[PDB]
């Protein structure tokens, strides 16, 4: 008539499996006050504090399970009409050491995604918090500093009628965690860099409103009296000279109602803004579909002859750069029927088929990178 406790199944060390419902760990509601200006920290905390925000089916499983060999899945949601737009981002970095920066340079290297709710009414990011292995723990997330920053990069185009709320659904995924380590002296391929290369703003009118971006990319971001930094750059700067194929990601952050055809090419800084003749250069013309927000741009390694310098002193006059630049131009005009400024953000996602000849002793600080209102 007796029961053996020993042969009871109370000692199962396994990763939660189930339906997207069953594997729901939390529900965070984030607030998007209609007077939001851009560069605004909507909520910066600890992941573990983000996940511990509701009692949902695998919630205790998150807390009373020591090894989770699956992935944190976010599902965000806020709908905004087509005559306005906000540019939000979820940045997950691996630790915070103090009163840290919440730019976008500084918070987009590990795993972060930008989205204009007017175009993308529901985003889903998945990440692996221990970039070094295949499992995580809540206590890990807790006692290590895993951070989640939710920021506005380019504020409202049109100010909505009342406040808004972004609801992020958090879950554990059905897919395994895969590492992403960096050997600093023997890079991989494709090398993951993820660099905010700039927030390009084109005013309304018939101005070629030509934006030039340095292709020298070590030290990182400039600050008044300081340098801003993210690992994927830290390491790059460990090298001296570089080449490869540069893959850029152009995102629209303004309201699908602000129109422009933007022309991208590759040149040098010695050219005047009135150079009729550039479009006689390899160039690619970009145009955004109403609800289209991401154009991926690929420049091949054949657009560069010789490797270039990883760093160039900050004063080096647009007449002395011997390093290739990434020029963006208005091929037509900026046109709208509502006040607004066309804003598109550029992020260097991966350098593919890289070649790094060298080792950089260093050069003090770096130059500035675009930013501004809304």
């Amino acid at each position: 008539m007796e029961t053996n406790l020993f042969k009871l199944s109370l000692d199962d060390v396994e990763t939660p499996k189930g339906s997207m419902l069953d594997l729901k760990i939390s529900q965070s509601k984030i607030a998007l006050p209609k007077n939001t200006v851009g560069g605004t920290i909507l909520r910066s905390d600890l992941l573990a504090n983000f996940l511990t925000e509701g009692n949902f089916r695998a919630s205790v499983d998150l807390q009373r399970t020591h090894r989770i060999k699956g992935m944190i899945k976010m599902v965000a949601t806020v709908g905004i009409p087509e005559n306005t737009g906000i540019a939000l981002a979820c940045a997950m970095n691996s630790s915070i050491r103090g009163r840290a920066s919440s730019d976008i340079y500084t918070i987009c290297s590990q795993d972060c995604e930008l989205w204009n709710p007017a175009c993308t009414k529901a985003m889903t990011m998945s990440f692996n918090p221990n970039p070094c292995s295949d499992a995580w723990s809540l206590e890990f997330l807790k006692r290590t500093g895993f951070h989640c920053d939710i920021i506005c990069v380019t504020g409202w185009t049109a100010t909505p009628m009342q406040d808004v709320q972004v609801t992020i659904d958090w879950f554990i995924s059905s897919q395994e965690c895969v590492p992403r380590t960096y050997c600093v002296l023997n890079p991989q391929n494709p090398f993951v860099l993820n660099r905010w290369m700039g927030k390009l703003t084109f005013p309304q009118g018939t101005s070629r409103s030509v934006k030039r971006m340095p292709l020298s990319i070590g030290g990182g971001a400039g600050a008044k009296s300081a340098i801003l930094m993210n690992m994927p750059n830290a390491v790059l700067s460990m090298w001296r000279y570089f080449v490869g194929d540069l893959v850029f990601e152009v995102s629209k952050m303004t309201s699908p109602y602000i129109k422009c055809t933007v022309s991208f090419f590759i040149a040098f800084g010695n050219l005047a803004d009135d150079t009729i003749n550039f479009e006689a250069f390899p160039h690619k013309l970009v145009q955004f579909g109403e609800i289209q927000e991401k154009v991926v741009l690929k420049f091949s390694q054949e657009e560069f002859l010789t490797a270039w310098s990883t760093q160039v002193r900050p004063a080096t006059t647009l007449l002395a750069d011997g390093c290739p630049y990434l020029y963006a131009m208005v091929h037509d005009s900026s046109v709208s029927t509502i006040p607004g400024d066309f804003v598109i953000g550029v992020k260097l996602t991966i350098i593919e088929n890289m070649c790094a000849y060298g080792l950089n002793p260093g050069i003090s600080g770096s130059r500035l990178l675009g930013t501004i209102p809304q």
């Binding site: 970095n93 691996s94 630790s95 915070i96 050491r97 103090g98 009163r99 840290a100 920066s101 500084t106 918070i107 290297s109 590990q110 221990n130 970039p131 070094c132 292995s133 890990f140 006692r143 290590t144 500093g145 951070h147 590492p179 992403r180 380590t181 960096y182 050997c183 600093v184 002296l185 023997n186 890079p187 070590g218 030290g219 600050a223 009296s225 300081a226 340098i227 801003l228 930094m229 993210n230 690992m231 830290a234 390491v235 700067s237 460990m238 090298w239 001296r240 790094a356 060298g358 080792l359 950089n360 002793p361 260093g362 003090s364 600080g365």
Partner: protein, 185 residues
């Protein structure tokens, strides 16, 4: 791989208090957190410290997970008006993972070379993730690498310069989200 010879890069430059009263003792004391990026100092004086916003210095401050071998170099540039028959200074160097008295020393060097000395040695970062370590994290009551110093007649053995170099096998992963580094002038 990716390599170049004799290209090391700067991290530390510690200078000794000028105002030092050879009366409340003979020595001055200081430490460098190699894997953290912080110079901790005495109350002996007004110390002049600088950490260099180097490719590496820069890198180690930002990279949350560290596995591998880094190369260190400490150089003593001293007071050269002091006549060599008149030298009274040693400088005791230590290598620990905590700034605790209860922790024990890894390596221990003591150098007493007039006006200048050099010291080249390997440090290796071994940790609990997959062999990866995080700066003084509570996770596996984790630690670092510290290079502390003790200067006797600090008016003589005046300046200290710390350089490190990287190993073909240094691997990082993750971003320790850090404030803006201050750049002089």
């Amino acid at each position: 791989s990716i390599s170049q010879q004799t290209v090391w890069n700067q991290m530390a430059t510690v200078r000794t208090p000028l105002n030092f009263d050879s009366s409340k003792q003979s020595f001055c004391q200081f430490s460098v957190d190699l894997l953290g990026g912080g110079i901790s100092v005495d109350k002996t004086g007004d110390w002049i410290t600088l950490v260099q916003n180097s490719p590496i210095s820069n890198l180690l401050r930002v990279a949350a997970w560290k596995k591998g071998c880094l190369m260190v170099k400490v150089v003593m540039s001293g007071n050269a008006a002091v006549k060599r028959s008149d030298w009274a200074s040693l400088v005791q160097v230590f290598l620990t993972n905590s700034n605790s008295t209860e922790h024990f020393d890894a390596c221990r060097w003591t150098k007493s070379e007039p006006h200048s000395w050099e010291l080249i040695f390997p440090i290796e970062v071994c940790g609990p993730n997959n062999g990866f370590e995080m700066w003084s994290s509570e996770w596996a009551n984790q630690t670092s690498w510290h290079l502390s110093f003790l200067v006797d007649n600090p008016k003589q053995s005046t300046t200290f310069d710390v350089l490190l170099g990287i190993s073909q096998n240094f691997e990082i992963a993750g971003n320790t989200l850090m404030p803006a580094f201050s750049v002089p002038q």
